[PDB]
Amino acid sequence: SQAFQRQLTALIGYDVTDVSNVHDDELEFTRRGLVTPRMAEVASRDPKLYAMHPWVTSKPLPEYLWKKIANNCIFIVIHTSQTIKVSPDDTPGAILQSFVLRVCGRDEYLVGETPIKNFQWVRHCLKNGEEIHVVLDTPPDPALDEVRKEDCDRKFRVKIRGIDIPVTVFVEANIQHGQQVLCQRRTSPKPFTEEVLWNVWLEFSIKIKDLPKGALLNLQIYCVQLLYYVNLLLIDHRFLLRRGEYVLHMWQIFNADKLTSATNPDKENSMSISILLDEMPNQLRKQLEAIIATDPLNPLTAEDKELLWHFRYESLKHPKAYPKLFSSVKWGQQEIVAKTYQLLARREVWDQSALDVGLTMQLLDCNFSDENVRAIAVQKLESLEDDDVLHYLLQLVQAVKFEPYHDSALARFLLKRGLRNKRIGHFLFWFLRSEIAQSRHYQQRFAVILEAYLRGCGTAMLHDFTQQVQVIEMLQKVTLDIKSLSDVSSQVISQLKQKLENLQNPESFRVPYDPGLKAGALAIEKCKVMASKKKPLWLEFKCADPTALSNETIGIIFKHGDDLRQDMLILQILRIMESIWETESLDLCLLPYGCISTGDKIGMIEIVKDATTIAKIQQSTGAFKDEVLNHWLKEKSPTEEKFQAAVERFVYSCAGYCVATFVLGIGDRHNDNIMITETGNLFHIDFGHERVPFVLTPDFLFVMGTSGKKTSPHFQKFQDICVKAYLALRHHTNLLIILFSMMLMTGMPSKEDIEYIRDALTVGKNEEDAKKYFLDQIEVCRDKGWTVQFNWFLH
Ligand SMILES: CSc1nccc(-c2ccc3nc(NC(C)=O)sc3c2)n1
């Protein structure tokens, strides 16, 4: 029967049928709309390849990795087991006749027409110098992917009737098109009582014909302080102007939440509003080019826009110009939007333009409501490969918040690519689910998209998702209860022990942050409760796969009290930073541990094996000491090779974070939050948690062979890597600025904050300046030594 809709609801965390919180039928129309994209991708997909999900690339194997193929040969261990020699560009389809190739312990298969070098797992191994273990296996049944069978010249105007609260005031109405205010009207102020009626007409100056699709009536209540906001889409999803009586429950108090077409579902408590609807000169060329060259966050003066619009067609031959050219369109004029479209009809240079993800992203941000503009960005995304889509997904998802309508190219794109690849499909799930679970502002839209995906991923995936949700809700329950019962107490660990007995009577589940890894039974004697302020559960599980090479059990932390959505975003940008460096033969040894937000200030975390905190390494002797980090680093490594590798790994990873963590503006971190692996790899944790640009303390320096006033061949390497790392990122200024900007608009608590990255990336500066800029930032750190780290102790 429809019991299927109940399980969907439970998977999704929201009931998409529930037609309570709607004043029109856009969500339903979208549920209906997304059926054919769902069905088309399901039909188009190859059952074999879809069943095995080969993680693959096209990108040229980086040089530093070819240095670990100094023989033109690669060792593979097939499983009693035997080693085999294989050429870099041999097919797994070929080396089978060398007498289905599945990775040991993992749900990862090596299949299809591509060199073995083009498989991510192979590239993962070479990076680490670990022998490729592959079980000789027969492919899983594609049958388990079974999908269940299913001309107006009048001026626009609005009647503000009044507002109502259950438990000095004026309404403001704005006709908005993507952050542009096309027109603005106010009501007369009135004493602020529970019910305040105006029954006024507000007549705008923008004529009805001049309303563009995607235009919001944004209603705001002021006391002067903004108190409550609400939005209604003036032109609706069927292409019809808004009409009729409307009662909208408003949100209580810049971020993506202010743009939503959703209404406050809390009717018991919320404020509501009743409304009623019934060829050029050298120099101008030089000025134009200087406009197009400016970073994405550099404001256009009115002189700029009139210029850009005038040389419209000449501006079109530059893709870098597109965000700027479409930010100069007067969307509140019918004749102009028309011209804009004759122009978009001949966007031929952009179609042939090599795909610029950074450029692409801009046309999807808060500043473009036109869906035809937004579509040309989505058009470029069509050519991205899976590996690429996986780098951008979290932020492509977040960009759905900026779409004016629930059904768009973007939402359809994420749907297609999720339906076409289990791994993308896996992450898409948890991303959407995380947003559905915690944003009242966007759950309705995100829930609809997630239904649309779950009704097409097939029964296997469906049952996969079932186990994970069951498990994470089971464990979440436990996570909160313990925080209620609290440094670490005595009963607490026994109380925990006893709770973990109750919830093992689902027996296997995919780790949400690494879908390749099966988590079997818990290891109940290994589970603890950490001594940090928020009392998170240290939990580990035995791997479900018997075909695993070892018994290194999977560790996952469960935490409530911090915004892991923020962690998630930072980490994604970290993976994008590695991705730039990789294309410039740079491995900065970033360790961006796996992490998913599952609810409100609550989620999960990848435990990185063989690592501790630098604060813990200091604790081991408030009176800090210089030597103990190098001392600790030695007493872990047996051989001199390993220690020399470890110290190098430190020099790269430290440079890596110093660059990353500086550019993102999260440099000034406490001791507790930086961690190092015994293998030398350093990494930061907790992003939901007299200044300094980045942590580079005298114990860090001591390891490089430096204290106070000194330098070493290993330290001069550090600066060499930094600078090179620093101007690598700078080559992708436009990309970074967008990602940063979108991360704030969709993930954090202002115009000011958005521009740290402009100062951090030093826009307008030449190359040799930036060299010196970062080198002097290194210098600043040497001075403060332990004063700032001591601050965080006092704090
Ligand atoms: C507690 S709060 C927190 N918040 C964000 C992130 C984290 C985190 C991440 C990774 C991580 N790896 C660890 N490895 C070992 C061996 O202990 S511990 C740890 C902790 N913790």
Q: Is residue 472 annotated as involved in ligand binding?
A: no
Distance (Å, rounded) from C-alpha 230 to C-alpha 227?
11
DSSP letter for each residue of 536-547: -EEEEEEES-TT
- 243 class by beta-carbon count within 10 Å (0-12 exposed, 13-18 middle, 19+ buried): exposed
Query: Contact, 699 vs 654, CB < 8 A?
Result: no
Beta bridge partners of 597: 603
Please name which of 117, 44, 47 lies closest in space to residue 417, comparing C-alpha atoms.
Answer: 44
The separation between CA 664 and the C-alpha centre of its own chain, rounded to angstroms, equals 14
Q: Is residue 762 annotated as involved in ligand binding?
A: no
**In this structure, what token pair is assigned to residue 298?**
């550099």
Q: Is residue 18 annotated as involved in ligand binding?
A: no
Number of C-beta neighbours around residue 654 at 10 A: 28
Query: Contact, 288 vs 311, CB < 8 A?
Result: yes
Q: Which atom of ligand 1 is nearest to the CA of 536?
A: 1
Distance (Å, rounded) from C-alpha 486 to C-alpha 484?
6
Query: Contact, 45 vs 375, CB < 8 A?
Result: no
Please name which of 46, 48, 55 lies closest in space to residue 142, comparing C-alpha atoms.
Answer: 48
Distance (Å, rounded) from C-alpha 127 to C-alpha 130?
8
* Ligand 1 mutation pick, 560, 673, 686, max ligand atoms within 8 A of CB: 686
Describe the crossing of helices 422-436 and 386-398 by its angle, rounded to 10 degrees.
10
Class of domain 610-790 (CATH, top level): mainly alpha
Domain ranges within the chain, ordered by starting residue = 1-149, 150-278, 279-458, 459-609, 610-790
Reduced to 3 states, what is the DSSP secondary structure of residue 140? coil
Please name which of 7, 2, 3, 1 lies closest in space to residue 451, comparing C-alpha atoms.
Answer: 7
Reduced to 3 states, what is the DSSP secondary structure of residue 353? coil
Task: Supply the CATH classification number for the domain 150-278.
Answer: 2.60.40.150
Where do the H-state alpha helices sit in 294-385? 302-310, 312-315, 322-325, 334-345, 348-352, 357-362, 371-381
Q: To one decimal place, what's the resolution in Å?
A: 2.9
**In this structure, what token pair is assigned to residue 614?**
């630098």
Beta bridge partners of 230: 219
Shortest-distance Cα residue to atom 18 of ligand 1 = 607
Distance (Å, rounded) from C-alpha 669 to C-alpha 33?
47
**In this structure, what token pair is assigned to residue 563?**
């915004």
For residue 605, how far is its CA from the centre of ligand 1 (angstroms)? 7
459-609: which CATH number, 3.40.50.460, 3.40.50.2300, 3.30.1010.10, 3.40.30.10? Answer: 3.30.1010.10
Task: Supply the CATH classification number for the domain 279-458.
Answer: 1.25.40.70
Angle (nearest 5°) at CA 337 between 331 and 341:
140
Ligand 1: does its nearest atom lie under 6 Å from the Cβ of 552? no
| Strand boundaries in 178-291, DSSP class E | 180-186, 195-207, 216-222, 226-233, 244-249, 251-252, 272-277
Q: Is residue 591 annotated as involved in ligand binding?
A: yes
Q: How was this structure determined?
A: X-ray
| Strand boundaries in 223-293, DSSP class E | 226-233, 244-249, 251-252, 272-277
For residue 43, how far is its CA from the centre of ligand 1 (angstroms)? 42
Query: Contact, 538 vs 529, CB < 8 A?
Result: yes
Ligand 1: does its nearest atom lie under 6 Å from the Cβ of 686? yes
For residue 685, how far is its CA from the centre of ligand 1 (angstroms)? 6
Please name which of 183, 173, 154, 203 lies closest in space to residue 274, comparing C-alpha atoms.
Answer: 173
Ligand 1: does its nearest atom lie under 6 Å from the Cβ of 559? yes
Please name which of 794, 795, 792 lies closest in space to residue 668, comparing C-alpha atoms.
Answer: 792
For residue 188, how far is its CA from the centre of ligand 1 (angstroms)? 55
Distance (Å, rounded) from C-alpha 507 to C-alpha 598?
20
Describe the crossing of helices 715-730 and 564-582 by its angle, rounded to 10 degrees.
100
Distance (Å, rounded) from C-alpha 633 to C-alpha 628?
8
Task: Supply the CATH classification number for the domain 1-149.
Answer: 3.10.20.90
Distance (Å, rounded) from C-alpha 795 to C-alpha 793?
5
Beta strand 595-599 with 537-543: parallel, antiparallel or unpaired?
unpaired
Length of the chain: 795
Is 610-790 the same fold as 459-609? no
